[PDB]
């Protein structure tokens, strides 16, 4: 028994995969579903710091499963849960600014940025680990 599939990173009972290719946000959602996973939805501050650190070290602009597509300015996770007030701190300075209509959230440097949903970026999938 091993808790995660090969090349997946285990963290606090879940498995994480960072892509080595780039897609737009809607295709990133599909990419994760095809491996029985979900474009990463963040549930805790520890998990946030864990993901941002890898995004900073790798220096890769990376999609997360969050958008304000349904209502501009109200951010929602792809599993339907709302962005909580205790997560607003992770936006980068001056963000979210929706310049040129940016509806999808990404890891950018030390925090989050809203960027155009049609741009190709790396992504991270999340699924729960098996019990060994
Ligand atoms: C790399 O990050 C910058 O580019 C991202 C991609 O466009 C943005 O998503 C980020 O917000 C941020 N940004 C853009 C502007 C801006 C551009 C033109 C005129 N006025 C403001 N400000 N900050
Ligand atoms: Ca919009
Ligand atoms: Ca927006
Ligand atoms: Ca922005």
From Swiss-Prot:
C-type lectin domain residues: 11-126
Origin superkingdom: Eukaryota
Coiled coil spans: none
Binding site for Ca(2+): 95, 97, 99, 102, 113-114
Effect noted on mutating residue 97 to D: Loss of binding to ICAM3 and HIV-1 gp120
Disulfide bond sites: 4-15, 32-125, 104-117
Tissue localization of expression: Predominantly expressed in dendritic cells and in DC-residing tissues. Also found in placental macrophages, endothelial cells of placental vascular channels, peripheral blood mononuclear cells, and THP-1 monocytes.
Effect of residue 113 to D: Loss of binding to ICAM3 and HIV-1 gp120
Effect of mutating residue 98 to A: Loss of binding to ICAM3 and HIV-1 gp120
Note: In vitro, is a receptor for HIV-1 and transmits HIV-1 either in trans without DC infection, or in cis following a DC infection to permissive T-cells to induce a robust infection. Bound HIV-1 remains infectious over a prolonged period of time and it is proposed that bound HIV-1 is not degraded but protected in non-lysosomal acidic organelles within the DCs close to the cell membrane thus contributing to the HIV-1 infectious potential during transport by DCs from the periphery to lymphoid organs.
Swiss-Prot/TrEMBL domain comment: The tandem repeat domain, also called neck domain, mediates oligomerization.
Subunit structure: Homotetramer. Interacts with C1QBP; the interaction is indicative for a C1q:C1QBP:CD209 signaling complex. Interacts with ICAM2 and ICAM3 by binding to mannose-like carbohydrates. Interacts (via C-type lectin domain) with CEACAM1 (via Lewis X moieties); this interaction is regulated by the glycosylation pattern of CEACAM1 on cell types and regulates contact between dendritic cells and neutrophils. (Microbial infection) Interacts with HIV-1 and HIV-2 gp120.
Function as written in the Swiss-Prot or TrEMBL entry: Pathogen-recognition receptor expressed on the surface of immature dendritic cells (DCs) and involved in initiation of primary immune response. Thought to mediate the endocytosis of pathogens which are subsequently degraded in lysosomal compartments. The receptor returns to the cell membrane surface and the pathogen-derived antigens are presented to resting T-cells via MHC class II proteins to initiate the adaptive immune response. On DCs it is a high affinity receptor for ICAM2 and ICAM3 by binding to mannose-like carbohydrates. May act as a DC rolling receptor that mediates transendothelial migration of DC presursors from blood to tissues by binding endothelial ICAM2. Seems to regulate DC-induced T-cell proliferation by binding to ICAM3 on T-cells in the immunological synapse formed between DC and T-cells.
Protein name: CD209 antigen
UniProt source species: Homo sapiens (Human)
Gene of this entry: CD209
